[PDB]
């Protein structure tokens, strides 16, 4: 494709690594840096105007980061593996006051990724679809962004027919994680603004920036 599926894989492969909420925010900020690096290895993203590049990532970061840690956590049981190396587990999350949402990540993202055994090429493509969000407000050219998303849609549907021909509803199973991810992402931002506002959690510079 003009979204070559190997370039999306390479980009995911290019960036492999007391209070759970402090630990999660620290991993988020750490990884926010390498998210920028990931974005620049997706085909055509750097070719966009800088203002749009900023917008897409300011819109996508939270959903982009959650998908990435979620897929990383496939192998852990009733928990999450932060990019820092630390596990967070259901119990720790519930007992630090953020259990409802943590459970949603597990059941709707982490365990669903496990049950369908989605690969890095698939995750990368879902993550790229998220990055190229034509609905993001303030975009200088939404059409060229919808076009890039349509290309990833084509490349992924191609990949899924080649690699998993025995399951013809896989393309759609992949894309139906994205509304869940949007709902989970919005709930996480809503948590994060409230954390910032009351000041119960230290929040590093790059996350602070994204939150303004």
């Amino acid at each position: 494709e003009d979204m070559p599926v190997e370039r999306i894989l390479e980009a995911e492969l290019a960036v492999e690594p007391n209070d759970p909420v402090t630990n999660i925010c620290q991993a988020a900020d750490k990884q926010l840096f390498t998210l920028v690096e990931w974005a620049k290895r997706i085909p055509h993203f750097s070719e966009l105007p800088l203002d749009d590049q900023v917008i897409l990532l300011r819109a996508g970061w939270n959903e982009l980061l959650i998908a990435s840690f979620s897929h990383r956590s496939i192998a852990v049981k009733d928990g999450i593996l932060l990019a820092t190396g630390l596990h967070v587990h259901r119990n720790s999350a519930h007992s630090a006051g953020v259990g409802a949402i943590f459970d949603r990540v597990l059941t709707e993202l982490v365990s669903k990724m496990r049950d369908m055994q989605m690969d890095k090429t698939e995750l990368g493509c879902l993550r790229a679809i998220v990055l190229f969000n034509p609905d993001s407000k303030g975009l200088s050219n939404p059409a060229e962004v919808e076009a890039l998303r349509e290309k990833v849609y084509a490349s992924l549907e191609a990949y899924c027919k080649h690699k998993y021909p025995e399951q013809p509803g896989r393309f759609a199973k992949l894309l139906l994680r994205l509304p869940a991810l949007r709902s989970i992402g919005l709930k996480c931002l809503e948590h994060l603004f409230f954390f910032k506002l009351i000041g119960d959690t230290p929040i590093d510079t790059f996350l602070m920036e994204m939150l303004e």
């Binding site: 920028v36 750097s46 800088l50 590049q53 300011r58 790059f206």
Partner: peptide, 11 residues
């Protein structure tokens, strides 16, 4: 949004 702009530059 300084940090992000600074990181997105590479050419």
């Amino acid at each position: 949004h300084k940090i992000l702009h600074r990181l997105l530059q590479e050419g």
